[PDB]
Amino acid sequence: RTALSPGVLSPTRPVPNWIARPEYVGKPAAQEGSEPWVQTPEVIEKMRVAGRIAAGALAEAGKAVAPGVTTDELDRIAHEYLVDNGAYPSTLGYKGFPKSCLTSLNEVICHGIPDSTVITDGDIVNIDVTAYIGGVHGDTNATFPAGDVADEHRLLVDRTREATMRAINTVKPGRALSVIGRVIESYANRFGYNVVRDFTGHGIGTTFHNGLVVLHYDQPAVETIMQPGMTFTIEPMINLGALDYEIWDDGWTVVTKDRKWTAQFEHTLLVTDTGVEILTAL
Ligand code: MET
Ligand SMILES: [Co+2]
Ligand SMILES: [Co+2]
Numbered sequence: 001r002t003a004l005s006p007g008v009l010s011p012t013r014p015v016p017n018w019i020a021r022p023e024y025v026g027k028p029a030a031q032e033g034s035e036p037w038v039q040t041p042e043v044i045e046k047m048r049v050a051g052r053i054a055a056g057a058l059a060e061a062g063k064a065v066a067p068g069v070t071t072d073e074l075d076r077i078a079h080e081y082l083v084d085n086g087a088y089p090s091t092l093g094y095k096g097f098p099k100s101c102l103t104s105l106n107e108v109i110c111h112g113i114p115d116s117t118v119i120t121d122g123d124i125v126n127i128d129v130t131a132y133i134g135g136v137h138g139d140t141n142a143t144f145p146a147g148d149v150a151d152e153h154r155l156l157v158d159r160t161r162e163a164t165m166r167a168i169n170t171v172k173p174g175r176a177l178s179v180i181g182r183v184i185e186s187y188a189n190r191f192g193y194n195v196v197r198d199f200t201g202h203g204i205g206t207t208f209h210n211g212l213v214v215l216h217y218d219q220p221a222v223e224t225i226m227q228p229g230m231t232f233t234i235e236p237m238i239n240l241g242a243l244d245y246e247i248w249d250d251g252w253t254v255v256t257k258d259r260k261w262t263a264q265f266e267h268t269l270l271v272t273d274t275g276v277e278i279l280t281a282l
């Protein structure tokens with residue numbers, strides 16, 4: 001199974017005019033980075049809707065993961081599930097991103113662009129979908145095996161899922177935000193994996209990446225305390241090999257230098273009055 005290279009991008013997928021675009025569509029940058037970290041009750045409930053739709057789109061595209069299928073096809077499926085449910089794919093036209101979801105195979109850490117790339121027996125495929133509806137976003141991702149995946153890789157996927165859900169289970173008001181990345185990095189290190197540091201979770205609400213940063217490694221210098229109504233992602237990328245990476249000429253696709261495989265899972269979370277709610281639960 002050879003190292004991946006860029007395929008052919010299909011043309012921009014249409015979304016019907018009635019679906020509200022986020023403000024940043026067709027602009028070089030987004031108006032984000034200074035929004036409140038705690039959301040209003042109205043926004044939280046809207047985020048439940050956006051989260052459920054993103055989770056649906058993810059599940060639908062994940063069902064299509066099989067050898068012989070293209071990453072473009074995964075994007076077609078996600079895109080149509082979002083549009084059918086009245087949501088705008090938040091990635092489409094976000095800082096020039098050309099598609100409706102991110103498809104990241106094997107050695108691709110993240111941010112792969114759906115294209116003519118064909119999935120083969122034994123690949124692992126991350127699909128990352130974000131929905132924008134009711135003026136809010138919901139952001140979720142998962143890595144799916146394609147055909148007969150090597151034990152080494154099934155384990156990596158299963159343990160990255162598990163790291164993610166363990167971190168989620170620590171979310172509670174009054175707990176330090178830094179606990180998330182301590183729980184993830186401990187679990188990863190237990191099996192000799194390395195957590196990606198340069199890519200992080202993020203606050204999300206009426207804007208996609210609102211300025212709050214959630215680290216996935218141990219960094220106890222962060223002083224942020226979780227507060228009821230805060231909304232953010234937990235989305236650790238976990239590597240078999242070393243952390244070093246390259247970014248393709250496309251400006252998006254991040255690949256391991258050593259070409260060893262890497263997995264990711266993501267949910268959007270709400271800090272409740274006493275614990276956590278997974279907004280992107282199926
Ligand atoms: C296109 S920027 C990356 C978007 C991705 N859905 C994330 O989880 O932030
Ligand atoms: Co995402
Ligand atoms: Co995210």
Ligand code: NA
Pocket residue numbers: 104105106107108109110126261262263
């Ligand atoms: Na990967």
